[PDB]
RNA sequence: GGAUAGUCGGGGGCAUUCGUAUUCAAUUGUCAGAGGUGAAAUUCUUGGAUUUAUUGAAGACGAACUACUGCGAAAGCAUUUGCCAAGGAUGUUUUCAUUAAUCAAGAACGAAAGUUAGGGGAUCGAAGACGAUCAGAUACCGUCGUAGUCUUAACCAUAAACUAUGCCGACUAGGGAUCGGGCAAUGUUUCUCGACUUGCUCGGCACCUUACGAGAAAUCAAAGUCUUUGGGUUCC
């Protein structure tokens, strides 16, 4: 029974996609069948913001921030809840919350 | 990057040994649904000194444009990149590590190459992302004596 | 075009004749117009062939490719070092 | 005008975590202290608290050498890992805020690869 | 759909349903009938002339004006090449494949697109014999495939 | 819908289609003549043509070809018939 | 006639020397009685000689090609000799 | 007893109405009739003689000298090379990778012929038995066969 | 089918340029732990461990841009540049005129792993080596590490080689995105053309709704036009 339309993964006038490598465990997941996540991260706490105002120089110049990206496979994303399973009608929903 | 080279009296002088920019600042830059286009070249000044630049740029959305796709075909970048390279030899023909950096402050390959390539395509963000010396002279010992020593 | 296809255009209609020999012949009667060269010729007898072609004032193409590529673009099933066009024809090679 | 600044390579890990004090150059380092000495356990080494008690050692050691402005350098394991900061790396950083040092120019050095050799799990990863 | 691809193209060409010359094209069907020969004569492709005299003259399709094809002209007046355009066309890229072959010795696709270039000219030639065009005693030849393109 | 005339399609539908969709295909393009901008001479071109044509008269270049209609450059007027 | 399925010129060989030890043989053998074309000449009339002499036939070019044992070109000359002119072209400007 | 061929090489004498004909290591793709040419201003082409000090980085040559003037030590065997890593203009010396894979620090002074020495691979054909191998070592030396020790 | 014009493509081969990452080597500043795990344990480290600074070497790999996007018959193809051969679509009042579809047999290509040798061997890593683990672990876990992963020349011939869906031809409903081409804009913009927007059309990758229609249903613009059963043709 196909579960999904796109098999679990959207590849179409392909034949070979290069794997990737997990975060929490690294396993060998294709390009497009993993699960890509934005973490813009800040390289100070929300209150140590002012700690670092107050202990720093350079007329309070603006922090900067962390850009990085997470590939995480079916299994890993779904225990860190990053997704989850849905039910069969709001499967098709591909708009992010 | 600035290398060391002679000590006189508790103070030792310093050279450019290169320039690049921050990870955070070539992590906001690059983004999705953009074309990037990567350009090098090997170039030698007026004395000898050997020096890999590498500047990157982006291309920009018009303004009413609704698609959020903004590419450009391949043909383009490879057009783009020509348009990089002939304005390298350009800005860098005809000047010493003092008129290179000279210009590399206000940014005037960006400036300068913009303008080029906006017939092609708009182009946004064009900064000299790195910029790494690979042949040194010998010391530089009178040359650094005759700059130096005001003040 | 390219000088392949200009050697096409000849063929049917112009004046042309194979070999070392009988390019020598072209060249001293002073009929030859053109002169094309094999790349992989003897370089003796490439010296003498634009020796020959200057006092001519015949015209001298060493063009790229070897005398098996270039028989076989001249239509020939053997070896072609030089060829001499005394006549182009209706084509524009000169 | 009378403030003298020092490089902070703070290594940031899960399992551990580094201060490394030096100078604007990274030769002639005036501290290197681990996160494993301040805690005895041989598993909270990349904890918060250990790496406050690291760094305001560090700190303290600092002050009495005489060199009070720090530019602060942040790298995590890179390459082939994880590449994300650990979660001593913040503790750290407010450590050397908090005990009365100038703190300038937060970057991030963690090396990045251009899709480098493979990483370790045998295509199915750490299975547990 | 394409012989020996997975296209679909529908490009070509549609013909006027007039079948008579322009108003102002007073081409006289003997004057056209000249330049084809003038343009035979030097041996440019029969399709190329008629691209120029479509061009460059401004002659309509020449059918519609002098009556014939332009291959049944040439061949009528006597300047009919040995082999068939399309024949011969592909003797020629057969060949420079061939020989692209012989230099770079591993390139499989090349070679996968020469196999159907000999399978194309293979099929066109045996068309070729039974509509008695050519001699009967047309075997192509691989090693003398370059005495068959000239 | 479920009526339509298509032995007389619209002079506008016909004009939205493509060249062989038609009722009836044909030709789309068109055979100008062209005045040299210093000359007296008459020249006729194609639309769609694939070779530069050179006029006989003291003149430049008389079209470009491109992918599909030929660029016009030269300050030249056009009649087509 | 075929002849032979698989040893070729080895089968002078018979049944010893091992049947990998023969087709190894056979393939480096197959190279050095391989004709291969002049590149000053056009004929395929270049024979090797003690295993590095290649040598071409004819009233022309009889001059003496310096190559590997058993080919004219080695896959590492054709590489050296292409970064030599890389390096070659780059250096003179 | 060498597996690489070896190349007569006629030059003109300088000083003396006189020719002199060399025994160059044959480099692969040299023919008869070839212009050699050997010195500091020799162009980067296969089969010149030239300093290693006046050559980029990466070059392959043979017959390079260990010292200058002791006409050629490393890379003589056939099918091997030496490949130049890098150089250091300050008391000038070159490093290079000999076929062994060791790095060995020269003069800057010191000639190498570019190119590959000729005779390409050679032990890649099996000897196939005791006749040839006899044959190969007979123009050699008296070293074949080998009788093991804990047979005696 | 063959030309011809502008193209287009992460299509193929050869040469060539760049990138940091990993490991290793020298030297330098320093000393107590370093690694690792859920917790450990092994191992190495006051002889200078880990970290940090300079230089060099090795091979592997092209992150971010990387997309329900592109190319290739499939397997597959992602750094720059140059050369060679080729390919689809589009435009075309270009040429021949049935030259076409399907394939038993017959042949080319054919992931990864496996084989023969040469070169090369950084990381990972079959086999294996140790230490917790449960009652037993012998397997998962941590470190090391063999064949292997790279390339050259010869082999084979299979996988969930998938769209679990043979190929060609015709017809069949509504929408909006998307790649390539072409046509039109007294529309915007740019130091003669390019970028953006809009409309039409052809050729692709697809998506949402609906089910006249099909199915056992899941579902399907084909798996529809089939008890109202027959367009042509291979495999099973
Ligand atoms: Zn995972
Ligand atoms: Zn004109
Ligand atoms: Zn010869």
Same mark, same amino acid.
């Given at each position: 029974?196909?579960?999904?339309?796109?098999?679990?993964?959207?590849?179409h006038?392909?034949?070979?996609?290069?794997?990737?490598?997990?975060?929490?465990? !690294?396993?060998?997941?294709?390009?497009?069948?993993?699960?890509?996540?934005?973490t813009?991260?800040?390289?100070?706490?929300?209150?140590?913001?002012?700690?670092?105002?107050?202990?720093?120089?350079?007329?309070?110049?603006?922090?900067?921030?962390?850009?990085?990206?997470?590939?995480?496979?079916? !299994?890993?994303?779904?225990?860190?809840?990053?997704?989850?399973?849905?039910?069969?009608?709001?499967?098709?929903?591909?708009?992010?919350? | 990057?600035?290398?060391?080279?002679?000590?006189?009296?508790?103070?030792?002088?310093?050279?450019?040994?290169?320039?690049?920019?921050?990870?955070?600042?070539?992590?906001?830059?690059?983004?999705?649904?953009?074309?990037?286009?990567?350009?090098?070249?090997?170039?030698?000044?007026?004395?000898?000194?050997?020096?890999?630049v590498?500047?990157?740029?982006?291309?920009?959305?018009?303004?009413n444009?609704?698609?959020?796709?903004?590419?450009?075909?391949?043909?383009?970048?490879?057009?783009?990149?020509?348009?990089?390279?002939?304005?390298?030899?350009?800005?860098?023909?005809?000047?010493?590590?003092?008129?290179?950096?000279?210009?590399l402050?206000?940014?005037?390959?960006?400036?300068?190459?913009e303008?080029?390539?906006?017939?092609?395509?708009?182009?946004?963000?064009?900064?000299?992302?790195?910029?790494?010396?690979?042949?040194?002279?010998?010391?530089?010992?009178?040359?650094?004596?005759?700059?130096?020593?005001?003040? | 075009? &390219?000088?392949?296809?200009?050697?096409?255009?000849?063929?049917?209609?112009?004046?042309?004749?194979?070999?070392?020999?009988? &390019?020598?012949? &072209?060249?001293?009667?002073?009929?030859?117009?053109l002169?094309?060269?094999?790349?992989?010729?003897?370089?003796?007898?490439?010296?003498?062939?634009?020796?020959?072609?200057?006092?001519?004032k015949?015209?001298?193409?060493?063009?790229?490719?070897?005398?098996?590529?270039?028989? &076989?673009?001249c239509?020939?099933?053997?070896?072609?070092?030089?060829?001499?066009?005394?006549?182009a024809?209706?084509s524009?090679?000169? | 005008?009378?403030?003298?600044?020092?490089?902070?390579?703070?290594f940031?890990?899960?399992?551990?975590?580094?201060?490394?004090?030096?100078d604007?150059?990274?030769k002639?380092?005036?501290?290197?202290?681990?996160?494993?000495m301040?805690?005895?356990?041989?598993?909270?080494?990349?904890?918060?608290?250990?790496?406050?008690?690291?760094?305001?050692?560090?700190?303290?050691?600092?002050?009495?050498?005489?060199?009070?402005?720090?530019?602060?350098?942040?790298?995590?394991?890179?390459?082939?890992?994880?590449?994300?900061?650990?979660?001593?790396?913040?503790?750290?950083?407010?450590?050397?805020?908090?005990?009365?040092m100038?703190?300038?120019?937060?970057?991030?050095?963690?090396?990045?690869?251009?899709?480098?050799?493979?990483?370790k799990?045998?295509?199915?990863?750490?299975?547990? | 759909?394409?012989?020996?691809?997975?296209g679909?193209?529908?490009?070509?060409?549609?013909?006027?349903?007039?079948?008579?010359?322009?108003?102002?094209?007073?081409?006289?069907?003997?004057?056209?009938?000249?330049?084809?020969?003038?343009?035979?004569?030097?041996?440019?492709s029969?399709?190329?002339?008629?691209?120029?005299?479509?061009?460059?003259?401004?002659?309509?399709?020449?059918?519609?004006?002098?009556?014939?094809?332009?291959?049944?002209?040439?061949?009528?007046?006597?300047?009919?090449?040995?082999?068939?355009?399309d024949?011969?066309?592909?003797?020629?890229?057969?060949?420079?494949?061939?020989?692209?072959?012989?230099?770079?010795?591993?390139?499989?696709?090349?070679?996968?697109?020469?196999?159907?270039?000999?399978?194309?000219?293979?099929?066109?030639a045996?068309?070729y014999?039974?509509?008695?065009?050519?001699?009967?005693?047309?075997?192509?030849?691989?090693?003398?495939?370059?005495?068959?393109?000239? | 819908?479920?009526?339509?005339?298509?032995?007389?399609?619209?002079?506008?539908?016909?004009?939205?289609?493509?060249?062989?969709?038609?009722?009836?295909?044909?030709?789309?393009?068109?055979?100008?003549?062209?005045?040299?901008p210093?000359?007296?001479?008459?020249?006729?071109?194609?639309?769609?043509?694939?070779?530069?044509?050179?006029?006989?008269?003291?003149?430049?270049?008389?079209?470009?070809?491109?992918?599909?209609?030929?660029?016009?450059?030269?300050?030249?007027?056009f009649?087509?018939? | 006639?075929?002849?032979? #399925?698989?040893?070729?010129?080895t089968?002078?060989?018979?049944?010893?020397? *091992?049947?990998?030890?023969?087709?190894?043989?056979?393939?480096?053998?197959?190279?050095?009685?391989?004709?291969?074309?002049?590149?000053?000449?056009?004929?395929?009339?270049? #024979?090797?000689?003690?295993?590095?002499?290649?040598?071409?036939?004819?009233? *022309?070019? #009889?001059?003496?090609?310096? *190559?590997?044992?058993?080919?004219?070109?080695?896959?590492?000359?054709?590489?050296?000799?292409?970064?030599?002119?890389?390096?070659?072209?780059?250096?003179?400007? | 007893?060498?597996?690489?061929?070896?190349?007569?090489?006629?030059?003109?004498?300088?000083?003396?109405?006189?020719?002199?004909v060399?025994?160059?290591?044959?480099?692969?793709?040299?023919?008869?009739?070839?212009?050699?040419?050997?010195?500091?201003?020799?162009?980067?082409?296969?089969?010149?003689?030239?300093?290693?000090?006046?050559?980029?980085?990466?070059?392959?040559? $043979?017959?390079?000298?260990?010292?200058?003037?002791?006409?050629g030590?490393?890379?003589?065997? $056939?099918?091997?090379?030496?490949?130049?890593?890098?150089?250091?203009?300050?008391?000038?010396?070159? /490093?290079?990778?000999?076929?062994?894979?060791?790095?060995?620090?020269?003069?800057? $002074?010191?000639?190498g012929?570019?190119?590959?020495?000729?005779?390409?691979? /050679?032990?890649?054909?099996?000897?196939?038995?005791?006749?040839?191998?006899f044959?190969?070592?007979?123009?050699?030396?008296?070293?074949?066969? /080998?009788?093991?020790?804990?047979?005696?």
């Amino acid at each position: 029974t196909q579960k999904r339309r796109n098999n679990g993964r959207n590849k179409h006038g392909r034949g070979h996609v290069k794997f990737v490598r997990c975060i929490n465990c !690294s396993r060998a997941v294709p390009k497009d069948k993993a699960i890509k996540r934005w973490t813009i991260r800040n390289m100070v706490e929300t209150a140590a913001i002012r700690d670092l105002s107050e202990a720093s120089v350079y007329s309070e110049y603006t922090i900067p921030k962390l850009y990085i990206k997470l590939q995480y496979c079916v !299994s890993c994303a779904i225990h860190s809840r990053v997704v989850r399973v849905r039910s069969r009608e709001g499967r098709r929903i591909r708009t992010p919350p | 990057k600035l290398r060391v080279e002679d000590i006189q009296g508790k103070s030792c002088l310093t050279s450019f040994n290169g320039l690049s920019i921050t990870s955070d600042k070539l992590r906001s830059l690059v983004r999705k649904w953009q074309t990037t286009i990567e350009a090098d070249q090997t170039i030698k000044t007026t004395d000898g000194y050997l020096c890999r630049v590498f500047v990157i740029g982006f291309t920009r959305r018009r303004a009413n444009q609704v698609k959020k796709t903004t590419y450009a075909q391949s043909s383009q970048i490879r057009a783009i990149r020509q348009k990089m390279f002939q304005v390298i030899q350009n800005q860098t023909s005809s000047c010493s590590m003092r008129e290179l950096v000279q210009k590399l402050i206000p940014e005037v390959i960006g400036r300068e190459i913009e303008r080029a390539t906006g017939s092609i395509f708009p182009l946004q963000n064009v900064l000299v992302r790195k910029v790494k010396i690979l042949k040194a002279p010998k010391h530089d010992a009178q040359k650094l004596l005759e700059l130096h020593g005001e003040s | 075009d &390219t000088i392949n296809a200009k050697l096409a255009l000849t063929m049917k209609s112009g004046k042309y004749v194979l070999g070392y020999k009988s &390019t020598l012949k &072209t060249l001293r009667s002073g009929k030859a117009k053109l002169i094309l060269i094999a790349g992989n010729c003897p370089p003796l007898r490439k010296s003498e062939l634009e020796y020959y072609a200057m006092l001519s004032k015949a015209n001298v193409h060493h063009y790229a490719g070897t005398n098996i590529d270039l028989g &076989t673009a001249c239509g020939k099933l053997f070896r072609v070092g030089v060829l001499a066009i005394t006549d182009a024809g209706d084509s524009d090679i000169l | 005008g009378e403030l003298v600044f020092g490089v902070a390579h703070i290594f940031a890990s899960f399992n551990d975590t580094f201060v490394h004090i030096t100078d604007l150059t990274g030769k002639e380092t005036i501290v290197r202290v681990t996160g494993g000495m301040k805690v005895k356990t041989d598993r909270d080494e990349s904890s918060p608290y250990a790496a406050m008690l690291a760094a305001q050692d560090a700190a303290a050691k600092c002050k009495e050498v005489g060199i009070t402005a720090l530019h602060i350098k942040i790298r995590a394991t890179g390459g082939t890992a994880t590449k994300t900061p650990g979660p001593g790396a913040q503790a750290a950083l407010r450590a050397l805020a908090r005990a009365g040092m100038r703190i300038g120019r937060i970057e991030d050095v963690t090396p990045i690869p251009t899709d480098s050799t493979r990483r370790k799990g045998g295509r199915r990863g750490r299975r547990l | 759909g394409r012989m020996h691809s997975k296209g679909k193209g529908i490009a070509s060409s549609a013909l006027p349903y007039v079948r008579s010359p322009p108003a102002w094209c007073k081409a006289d069907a003997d004057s056209v009938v000249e330049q084809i020969l003038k343009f035979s004569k030097k041996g440019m492709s029969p399709s190329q002339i008629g691209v120029t005299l479509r061009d460059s003259h401004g002659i309509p399709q020449v059918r519609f004006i002098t009556g014939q094809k332009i291959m049944r002209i040439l061949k009528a007046n006597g300047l009919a090449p040995e082999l068939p355009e399309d024949l011969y066309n592909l003797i020629k890229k057969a060949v420079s494949v061939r020989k692209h072959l012989e230099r770079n010795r591993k390139d499989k696709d090349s070679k996968f697109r020469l196999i159907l270039i000999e399978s194309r000219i293979h099929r066109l030639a045996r068309y070729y014999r039974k509509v008695g065009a050519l001699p009967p005693t047309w075997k192509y030849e691989s090693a003398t495939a370059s005495a068959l393109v000239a | 819908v479920l009526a339509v005339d298509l032995l007389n399609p619209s002079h506008e539908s016909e004009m939205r289609k493509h060249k062989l969709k038609q009722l009836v295909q044909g030709p789309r393009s068109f055979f100008m003549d062209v005045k040299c901008p210093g000359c007296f001479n008459i020249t006729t071109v194609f639309s769609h043509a694939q070779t530069v044509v050179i006029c006989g008269s003291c003149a430049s270049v008389l079209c470009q070809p491109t992918g599909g209609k030929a660029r016009l450059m030269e300050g030249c007027s056009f009649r087509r018939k | 006639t075929k002849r032979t #399925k698989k040893v070729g010129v080895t089968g002078k060989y018979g049944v010893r020397y *091992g049947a990998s030890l023969r087709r190894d043989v056979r393939k480096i053998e197959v190279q050095q009685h391989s004709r291969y074309q002049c590149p000053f000449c056009g004929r395929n009339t270049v #024979k090797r000689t003690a295993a590095g002499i290649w040598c071409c036939n004819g009233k *022309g070019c #009889k001059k003496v090609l310096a *190559g590997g044992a058993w080919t004219v070109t080695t896959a590492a000359a054709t590489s050296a000799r292409s970064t030599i002119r890389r390096l070659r072209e780059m250096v003179e400007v | 007893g060498r597996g690489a061929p070896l190349a007569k090489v006629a030059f003109r004498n300088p000083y003396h109405y006189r020719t002199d004909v060399e025994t160059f290591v044959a480099t692969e793709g040299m023919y008869t009739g070839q212009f050699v040419y050997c010195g500091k201003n020799a162009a980067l082409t296969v089969g010149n003689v030239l300093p290693v000090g006046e050559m980029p980085e990466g070059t392959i040559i $043979s017959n390079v000298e260990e010292k200058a003037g002791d006409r050629g030590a490393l890379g003589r065997s $056939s099918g091997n090379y030496v490949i130049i890593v890098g150089h250091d203009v300050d008391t000038g010396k070159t /490093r290079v990778k000999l076929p062994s894979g060791a790095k060995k620090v020269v003069p800057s $002074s010191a000639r190498g012929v570019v190119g590959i020495v000729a005779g390409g691979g /050679r032990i890649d054909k099996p000897l196939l038995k005791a006749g040839r191998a006899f044959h190969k070592y007979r123009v050699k030396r008296n070293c074949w066969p /080998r009788t093991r020790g804990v047979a005696m």
